[PDB]
Amino acid sequence: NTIRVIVSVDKAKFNPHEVLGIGGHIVYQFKLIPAVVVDVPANAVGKLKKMPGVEKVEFDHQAVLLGKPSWPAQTIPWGIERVKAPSVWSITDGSVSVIQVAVLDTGVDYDHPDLAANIAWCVSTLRGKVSTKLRDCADQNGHGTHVIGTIAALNNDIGVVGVAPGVQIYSVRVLDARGSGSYSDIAIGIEQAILGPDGVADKDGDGIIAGDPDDDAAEVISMSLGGPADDSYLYDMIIQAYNAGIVIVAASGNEGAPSPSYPAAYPEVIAVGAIDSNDNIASFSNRQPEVSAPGVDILSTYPDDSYETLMGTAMATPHVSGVVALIQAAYYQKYGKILPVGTFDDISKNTVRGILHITADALGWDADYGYGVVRAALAVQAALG
Ligand SMILES: [Ca+2]
Ligand SMILES: [Ca+2]
Ligand SMILES: [Ca+2]
Numbered sequence: 001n002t003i004r005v006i007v008s009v010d011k012a013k014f015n016p017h018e019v020l021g022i023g024g025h026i027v028y029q030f031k032l033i034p035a036v037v038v039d040v041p042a043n044a045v046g047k048l049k050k051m052p053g054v055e056k057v058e059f060d061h062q063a064v065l066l067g068k069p070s071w072p073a074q075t076i077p078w079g080i081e082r083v084k085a086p087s088v089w090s091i092t093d094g095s096v097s098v099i100q101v102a103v104l105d106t107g108v109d110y111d112h113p114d115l116a117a118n119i120a121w122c123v124s125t126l127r128g129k130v131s132t133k134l135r136d137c138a139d140q141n142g143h144g145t146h147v148i149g150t151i152a153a154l155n156n157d158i159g160v161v162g163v164a165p166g167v168q169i170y171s172v173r174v175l176d177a178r179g180s181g182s183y184s185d186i187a188i189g190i191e192q193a194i195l196g197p198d199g200v201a202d203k204d205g206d207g208i209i210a211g212d213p214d215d216d217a218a219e220v221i222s223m224s225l226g227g228p229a230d231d232s233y234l235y236d237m238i239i240q241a242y243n244a245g246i247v248i249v250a251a252s253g254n255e256g257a258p259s260p261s262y263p264a265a266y267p268e269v270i271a272v273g274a275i276d277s278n279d280n281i282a283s284f285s286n287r288q289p290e291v292s293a294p295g296v297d298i299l300s301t302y303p304d305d306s307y308e309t310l311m312g313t314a315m316a317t318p319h320v321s322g323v324v325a326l327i328q329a330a331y332y333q334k335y336g337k338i339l340p341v342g343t344f345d346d347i348s349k350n351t352v353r354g355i356l357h358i359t360a361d362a363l364g365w366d367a368d369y370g371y372g373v374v375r376a377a378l379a380v381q382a383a384l385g
């Protein structure tokens, strides 16, 4: 019957009425890339390629969550210590106002007493519809609430504590109750993380997005999820985020493969591998990460008002995203600006990725651990030194 497809277009010639004309509909018009999500009867896709202004028709691929379960006063999970976050908190817990982290995942238990105060914005992109309603944005799986707690669980007398326990979180639900998500919804969730709550990327028109107090963009997009497919419009959204000054962090994958899933495999994205508490790379961790982090036996928040232990590269990812939030929060607190994102290759202290690379606890890049295990305390020293 009806398939979902993503059309790359020339906006001067693409007439959307041509798709309604063949029994299709417009699902979502991207604001930041020239592309549109459409539903068409499957036997009419051939007619789509043929319309004026249609440059490419791509099918809607599937990505999936990358965390799975391991089988009272406040605990500091072993991974938060390993990554050397508690030492940083006298400088910053990430609570500097221009800083937000967007977590594209299964949603969040937004009224969880260890999370709520840091939940700044809650949205859903599922099924190509942007929803800002609470029932839509709530986590129906648990995995997002877990990823989120590793980043930002409160420092208090309950539960757990995240890497950056003061940072504002934008929860962006791009994955359903089963942890499965379409590339379409994930590209839309990324656009939303750039647009933010006011729906405009660059409201004052000055060319600054991430790190501009006049805007409400996130500064980190964290994606603990992956698929085998490399689609154009998705990689275009990645570049829009990258160009806006957003650091993008994604899980390597859990199939013990030689290279990362997507989007972790894009040059603009920090691929993240998983270690255990013995500083062994997990066997499941996809190889050639950029950096690695705690991803086995990770205790964190879980629905509802509860706590759970999970494992996977999905768990390693938010430790890195939390480190990035500390670097950017410390740098903005001292200077009144953030660092550039940087590249895989980078070994300077002038770039977030540069700092991640050279402060990593290398156990010189390798195909197992990447540059090594991120260390917040040392990264924040490099950023400020
Ligand atoms: Ca911001
Ligand atoms: Ca806590
Ligand atoms: Ca905005």
Ligand SMILES: [Ca+2]
Binding pocket: 202, 203, 204, 205, 206, 207, 208, 209, 212, 214, 215
């Ligand atoms: Ca601006």
Ligand SMILES: [Ca+2]
Binding pocket: 204, 206, 208, 212, 213, 214, 215
């Ligand atoms: Ca401005």
